Design a protein around this nucleic acid. Structure first.
Ligand SMILES: Nc1ncnc2c1ncn2[C@@H]1O[C@H](COP(=O)(O)OP(=O)(O)O)[C@@H](O)[C@H]1O
Ligand SMILES: [Mg+2]
Ligand SMILES: [Zn+2]
Length: 682
RNA sequence: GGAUCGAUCGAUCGAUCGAUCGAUCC
């Protein structure tokens, strides 16, 4: 590849010894700019010394891509390129990998962990430091942790040969800025976070960049919601019936939350039902036998209410048949699991109106107008250009399958081939798609491939390799200015559209203010690129000193841990699970329970996605061992040579033995008890 | 099992927490 003029212009300030925050839209070719910077940096050293340039890549796909690119480009002059990730540093010494190599493409988390425990005492071992998607420097990003270590070494007084920051990004972003002054302040703060005084943008060779980074045009498609909703009536009646049934066992159900006006099929109702569910978990009775039944019935009632609300939310954006299939799948999973009297009554009450629900869903006179407008614009764009590819975005993982089923089950648009792509999802749930599946989906999506449209989540916003599309569609998709720019930089074809379909003026207003914030960011960058380097260095030094003082001031010491024995009970059945005395912490993050009395309290099931994070190994998954509970208590791992269950506090109620009060914790950091470290003995 | 980011919503007094969803990493 020949270095273009604007690429050399962007790489010119970096080949001088000063840190740079070079930014360019998607498709400019910043990887080649970083390659040129790396090539120029590794030759400025005379005979006797060499460089240790490092390259940070957050995501594993882009990490492997950059590693392969650097290998194909640099294994010809005599440089040793390597790469560390989660499946590489299981037992290999990272220090020997860094010392015996010149170019490293490790992930920021591995570097953070090494700097933390025992490896790489200082960042002076490297000479160059490139950050892929450097805009991710934020409150607590690993990039920001590495930069915090860098700044603590710099402003500590004992600084040595510090490396050079060549962090590359596509959109600097403004954050929560409202005017140009706040945008400039945020840009200066981000510049001081990376310890750089130069922002390299394309100014002279702007005509060459526009010949390959052609930006699309945006079209707002605000439509009207459905007026005749016969599906919401039956689901609302079922929700009212379930709420009235739940009010029988809990008279003060309306006082458990401070939400006054709740509406079915919204997010406020979801918050209300979650608050109610959390309030009935700490419900205590001096019987230890009636409290469990009431708590279980309330848990089931709130779960059914949450499922009804989710079905209404799905039907608001998709067809009535999709929410009905979701409800049928939920009730079939309920039937396959434990079947008590409450669940039997709920299932029979649902089946009482399931026939009317099916009759309403089969009626084609109440089709979602949003889907009608989507079909219209899709068929229009595919009649104008048959060789078009769509990257239609959807904010919900449960809605991409609905959109795929709607596209497949529609005779009006048969030229489409769904190529849906969601992502890895939860690491302890059987949801999402794996990395090989994602690679196969992305490889089969080309101009001549077997997929001309993919319904993707926010996974296609950050660094990823997708074909050049021209039919970007945002179906109720809204974010920030950074995500807006990332989405717009996806349709960089020769003439593209960025349609935004929604049924709410709030999304249109948010897109307008995002465009305004992008203009503000551009103006702030243009203003900042005219200041002197000395005053900018002084300003970023002052900002770094202030941030370091703030970070060193908020060093909250560990409070006095409650050295009192308390019991952890199941969150669904309120059954005695274990005690806080037999709780051991492996590596200050994972909490296990030892003892033969606890092994008979849970049951093991095969894990869907086994993997090793640091030194464990997911062998199974633990659930409650009651009559019919099936409550997720944690997971089963193998630390060194023995199988141990590690649990999470987000599924256990903490009851004090002496006082008797119950409290709920979401993370183990909020649980301040006498945590004993794990001993390989016993 | 843990950590982090983004979006939306709720409580309290522009700020602090809480909830939902998506994504990333170990
Ligand atoms: N000088 C060049 N000549 C030919 N192709 C190039 C050149 N520079 C970049 N490209 C192509 O453009 C694509 C841009 O990818 P990359 O460099 O990662 O930037 P981005 O992250 O914006 O996509 C690369 O896949 C590369 O093949
Ligand atoms: Mg890049
Ligand atoms: Zn239980």
């Amino acid at each position: 590849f020949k270095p273009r003029n604007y690429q050399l212009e962007l790489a010119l300030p970096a080949m001088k010894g000063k840190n740079t925050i070079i930014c360019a839209p998607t498709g400019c070719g910043k990887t080649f700019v970083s390659l040129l910077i790396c090539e120029h940096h590794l030759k400025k050293f005379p005979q006797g010394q060499k460089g240790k340039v490092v390259f940070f890549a957050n995501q594993i796909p882009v990490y492997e891509q950059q590693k392969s690119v650097f290998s194909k480009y640099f294994e010809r002059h005599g440089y040793r390129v390597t790469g560390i990730s989660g499946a590489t540093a299981e037992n290999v010494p990272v220090e020997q990998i860094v010392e015996n190599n010149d170019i490293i493409i490790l992930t920021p988390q591995i570097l953070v962990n090494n700097l933390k425990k025992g490896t790489i005492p200082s960042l002076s071992i490297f000479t160059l430091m490139i950050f892929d998607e450097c805009h991710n420097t934020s409150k607590q990003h690993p990039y920001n942790m590495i930069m915090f270590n860098y700044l603590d070494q710099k402003l500590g007084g004992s600084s040595g040969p510090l490396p050079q920051v060549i962090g590359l990004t596509a959109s600097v972003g403004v954050g929560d800025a409202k005017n140009t002054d706040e945008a400039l302040d945020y840009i200066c703060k981000l510049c001081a976070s990376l310890d750089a005084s130069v922002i390299a943008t394309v100014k002279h060779n702007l005509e060459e960049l526009e010949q390959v980074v052609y930006k699309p045009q945006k079209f707002f498609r605000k439509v009207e919601s459905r007026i005749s909703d016969k599906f919401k009536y039956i689901i609302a009646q079922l929700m009212r019936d379930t709420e009235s049934l739940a009010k029988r066992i809990c008279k003060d159900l309306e006082n458990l939350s401070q939400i006054q006006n709740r509406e079915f099929g919204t997010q406020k109702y979801e918050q209300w039902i979650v608050t109610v569910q959390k309030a009935c978990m700490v419900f205590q009775m001096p019987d230890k036998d009636e409290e469990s039944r009431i708590c279980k019935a309330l848990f089931l009632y709130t779960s059914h209410l949450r499922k009804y609300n989710d079905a209404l939310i799905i039907s608001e954006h998709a067809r009535m048949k999709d929410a009905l299939d979701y409800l049928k799948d939920f009730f079939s999973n309920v039937r396959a699991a434990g079947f008590d009297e409450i669940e039997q009554d709920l299932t029979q009450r649902f089946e009482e109106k399931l026939q009317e629900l099916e009759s309403v869903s089969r009626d084609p006179s109440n089709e979602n107008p949003k889907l009608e407008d989507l079909c219209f614009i899709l068929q229009e764009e595919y009649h104008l250009n048959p060789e078009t590819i769509t990257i239609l975005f959807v904010k919900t993982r449960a809605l991409v399958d609905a959109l795929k089923n709607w596209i497949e089950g529609n005779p009006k648009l048969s030229f489409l081939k769904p190529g849906i792509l969601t992502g890895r999802g939860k690491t302890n749930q059987n949801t999402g798609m794996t990395l090989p599946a994602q690679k196969c989906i992305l490889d089969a999506f080309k101009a001549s491939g077997d997929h001309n449209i993919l319904i993707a989540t926010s996974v296609a916003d950050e660094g990823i390799d997708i074909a050049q599309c021209n039919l970007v569609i945002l179906y109720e998709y809204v974010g920030n200015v950074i995500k807006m720019i990332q989405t717009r930089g996806r349709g960089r074809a020769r003439g593209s559209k960025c349609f935004l379909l929604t049924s709410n003026a709030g999304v249109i207003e948010k897109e307008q203010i995002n465009m305004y914030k992008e203009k503000m960011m551009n103006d702030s960058i243009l203003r900042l690129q005219t200041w002197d380097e000395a005053v900018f260095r002084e300003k970023i030094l002052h900002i770094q000193t202030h941030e370091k003082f703030i970070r060193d001031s908020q060093e909250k010491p560990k409070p006095v841990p409650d050295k009192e024995n308390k019991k952890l009970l199941c969150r669904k059945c309120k059954a005695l699970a274990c005690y806080t005395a037999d709780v051991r912490v492996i590596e200050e993050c994972h909490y296990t329970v030892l003892g033969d009395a606890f092994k008979e309290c849970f049951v093991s099931r095969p894990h869907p996605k086994p993997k090793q994070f640091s030194s464990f190994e997911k062998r199974a998954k633990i659930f409650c061992a009651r009559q019919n509970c099936s409550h997720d208590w944690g997971i089963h791992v193998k630390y060194k040579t023995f199988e141990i269950p590690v649990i999470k506090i987000e599924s256990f109620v903490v009851e004090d033995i002496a006082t008797g009060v119950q409290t709920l914790y979401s993370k183990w950091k909020d649980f301040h008890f006498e945590k004993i470290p794990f001993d390989p003995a016993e």
